[PDB]
Swiss-Prot record, chains A, B, C:
Soluble monomer. Homotetramer. A dynamic intracellular population of tetramers and monomers coexists normally and the tetramer plays an essential role in maintaining homeostasis. Interacts with UCHL1. Interacts with phospholipase D and histones. Interacts (via N-terminus) with synphilin-1/SNCAIP; this interaction promotes formation of SNCA inclusions in the cytoplasm. Interacts with CALM1. Interacts with STXBP1; this interaction controls SNCA self-replicating aggregation. Interacts with SNARE components VAMP2 and SNAP25; these interactions allows SNARE complex assembly and integrity. Keywords: Acetylation, Alzheimer disease, Amyloid, Cell projection, Copper, Cytoplasm, Disease variant, Membrane, Metal-binding, Neurodegeneration, Nucleus, Parkinson disease, Parkinsonism, Phosphoprotein, Repeat, Secreted, Synapse, Ubl conjugation. It comes from Homo sapiens (Human). The modification Phosphoserine is found at S52. GO terms for biological process: adult locomotory behavior; amyloid fibril formation; behavioral response to cocaine; cellular response to copper ion; cellular response to epinephrine stimulus; cellular response to fibroblast growth factor stimulus; cellular response to oxidative stress; chemical synaptic transmission. It is linked to Genetic alterations of SNCA resulting in aberrant polymerization into fibrils, are associated with several neurodegenerative diseases (synucleinopathies). SNCA fibrillar aggregates represent the major non A-beta component of Alzheimer disease amyloid plaque, and a major component of Lewy body inclusions. They are also found within Lewy body (LB)-like intraneuronal inclusions, glial inclusions and axonal spheroids in neurodegeneration with brain iron accumulation type 1. This is Alpha-synuclein. It comes from the Eukaryota.
């Protein structure tokens, strides 16, 4: 049971993501894996998870 | 039981993410894994988790 | 049982994240894993967790 009358509702809203980058430098050497990412923006209302960032084993 | 009448409701809202970067330098050497990330913005209303950042075993 | 009449409600709201960086330097050497992250902003109303940052075992 739920009712709305003239209601401005906002659920799970994202407003603006500014990620102005510059002259960066990211070097990777002799690793098991590079999992470098960037901008991650998600909008949800009813879920069982989100953005997952997982690595794995390495060896030298 | 829930009722709204002329109500401006805001649930789970994100407003603005400024991440202006510059001349950074991130070098990785002889590791089991690099899990470098960046901007992570999520908006939720009813969930069972969020942004997960996990690594894994290494060896030298 | 819950009722609203002309009420401006704000639940779980994030307003502004300024993370202006500069000329940083992060070097990683001979570790089991680098879990370097950046900006993490979440907005929730009813959940069972948040942003998790976990590492894993290493070896030399």
């Amino acid at each position: 049971g739920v009712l709305y009358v003239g209601s401005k509702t906002k659920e799970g809203v994202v407003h603006g993501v500014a990620t102005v980058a510059e002259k960066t430098k990211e070097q990777v050497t002799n690793v098991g894996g590079a999992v470098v990412t960037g901008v991650t923006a998600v909008a949800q209302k009813t879920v069982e998870g989100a953005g997952s960032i997982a690595a794995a084993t390495g060896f030298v």
